[PDB]
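Assemble and predict.
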Amino acid sequence: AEPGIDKLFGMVDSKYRLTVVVAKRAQQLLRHGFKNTVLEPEERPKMQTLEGLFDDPNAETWAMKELLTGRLVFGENLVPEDRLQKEMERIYPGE
Amino acid sequence: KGEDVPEPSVPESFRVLVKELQALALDVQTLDEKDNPVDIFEGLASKR
Amino acid sequence: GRLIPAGTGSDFVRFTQVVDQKTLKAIEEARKEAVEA
Ligand SMILES: [Mg+2]
Ligand SMILES: [Mg+2]
Ligand SMILES: [Mg+2]
Ligand SMILES: [Mg+2]
Ligand SMILES: [Mg+2]
Ligand SMILES: [Mg+2]
Ligand SMILES: [Mg+2]
Ligand SMILES: [Mg+2]
């Protein structure tokens, strides 16, 4: 199956919550630039025609691969709705 | 354009209905948070 | 043709945001800036 799906399930209060997180994270990963990640250096996402997955194959396969680590934060109301998209555009280039 | 697909507009099934319904005396009007209008037929129903 | 009331379309999760500790300090810096003069 998929990497630590259990481990994931366990990090959320509701199953259907995990799905929204991953999806919204996948969203931002592409919109604001795909380098909006927290774990790129040593052991990261990879595909084999070359090791080129490092740039843009699957959005959420990343999202999940980050959420499985303890860097991200998903809350009910963590950061005010509109100020989030502003601070994100300011700090992440690639367009 | 490699754009993450957009968020759905109203289905024509719905609109086809509302009007079919309108064709008969009944008036079906969608409503807001507070009971107020909202618009399915994007801009084609207001007159002239 | 509206989103389903049940499922991921749950009032309990329809709203949930995500963060990077990098964007966490970035918003609090926005709060720091609120201090006038
Ligand atoms: Mg790495
Ligand atoms: Mg994480
Ligand atoms: Mg709210
Ligand atoms: Mg920009
Ligand atoms: Mg609709
Ligand atoms: Mg009515
Ligand atoms: Mg009133
Ligand atoms: Mg939302």
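The two ends of chain B are 35 Å apart (CA to CA).
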